[PDB]
């Protein structure tokens, strides 16, 4: 609701960032391997952007990626709803 | 509302374009460094497109980027709503 679907997105993005490094380390070639840029990747994913910076290459890496999209795109399909209603009515009055 | 969520997107896209150049200049390698293409990048971002043209590489650059996505995707999650209702009813009558 208010700042609720917000919080779940944050749990998803941290754990997603975390699990990606665990899943991607060990596969030769992957650049999704340090906790910083792994987090930026999970934003890049939870939010449709597709910049082509980082992406997974292992199987378990893509699975962690799917978990983010669903749990993200849904959260963000609700977080921007809140922002919309909020500031639009705010500026109305 | 009418042409309101419109205007906020424009504030976001200009300032976003502006701050990106400030944040990205100084980091060796970044191509997000001139006010023109910085603006095109912020459209590319406020609107899910992910063409892979420009993207940030500094930390503060990605932060400016996140501010755009939220303030953009939300604006654009409302700007296309207006357009939809508008022209669909227009053509109905």
């Amino acid at each position, epitope marked *: 609701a208010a700042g609720a679907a917000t919080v779940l997105l944050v749990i998803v993005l941290l754990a997603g960032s975390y699990l990606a*490094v665990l899943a*991607e380390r060990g596969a030769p*070639g992957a*650049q999704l391997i*340090t906790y910083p840029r792994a987090l930026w990747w999970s934003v890049e994913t939870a939010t449709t952007v597709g910049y082509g910076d980082l992406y997974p290459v292992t199987l378990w890496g893509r699975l962690v990626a799917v978990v983010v999209m669903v749990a993200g795109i849904t959260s963000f399909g609700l977080v921007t709803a809140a922002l919309a209603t909020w500031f639009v009515g705010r500026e109305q009055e | 509302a009418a042409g309101a969520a419109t205007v906020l997107l424009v504030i976001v896209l200009l300032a976003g374009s502006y701050l990106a150049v400030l944040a990205e200049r100084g*980091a060796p390698g970044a191509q997000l460094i001139t006010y023109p293409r910085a603006l095109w990048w912020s459209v590319e971002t406020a609107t899910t497109v992910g063409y892979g043209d420009l993207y940030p590489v500094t930390l503060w650059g990605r932060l400016v980027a996140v501010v755009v996505m939220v303030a953009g995707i939300t604006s654009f999650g409302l700007v296309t709503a207006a357009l939809a209702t508008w022209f669909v009813g227009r053509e109905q009558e």
Partner: antibody
Amino acid sequence: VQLQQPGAELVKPGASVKLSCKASGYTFTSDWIHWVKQRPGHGLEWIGEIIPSYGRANYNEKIQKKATLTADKSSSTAFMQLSSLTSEDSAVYYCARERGDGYFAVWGAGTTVTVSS
Amino acid sequence: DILLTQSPAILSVSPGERVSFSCRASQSIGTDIHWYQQRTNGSPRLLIKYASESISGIPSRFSGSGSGTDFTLSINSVESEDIANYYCQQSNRWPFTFGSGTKLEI
């Protein structure tokens, strides 16, 4: 001393050996422990990483995989098991503490392994 | 496995004078290179991290330069306490690799 590992070991050819790395200081959930090998007068040969908390280890693709990594989450000490050695396997063996951001901030003093009878 | 290539192998110089070890990667790694100093008998020791930023507790002579595939450790002046082997180690793609090494003579 941050990373702490013993002085030197002696292994008979073909035998095995374990190696320790006890780390006072912090023991983060997110820390990794790496091991690097330095044959005398040579470069730094990376062997493998291990995240002691979660428990997974990843070894070096190219080299002859003689080793296997372990940890002790309630002792803050990590181990490396080298099995069946030759004298091509005599070198210094450091451990390093990588924060998760991709560099070896803290190093051990290095253990000197000597495979001979 | 990314190939880090440190040329030259050895480096002569006279004291107090700028010196620049070069490193060159087999492909683009961005800024994810890091420099380590290792003296005789001693363990390695981080110098420059993420190719430009500095470590707290490092002589300001050491200047981190470069990006892309070209990289440069630089010492704005030299003194006798800097004689050591120098290594670079990338972190851009698994697995982390190391350079050949470069020793500094005076």
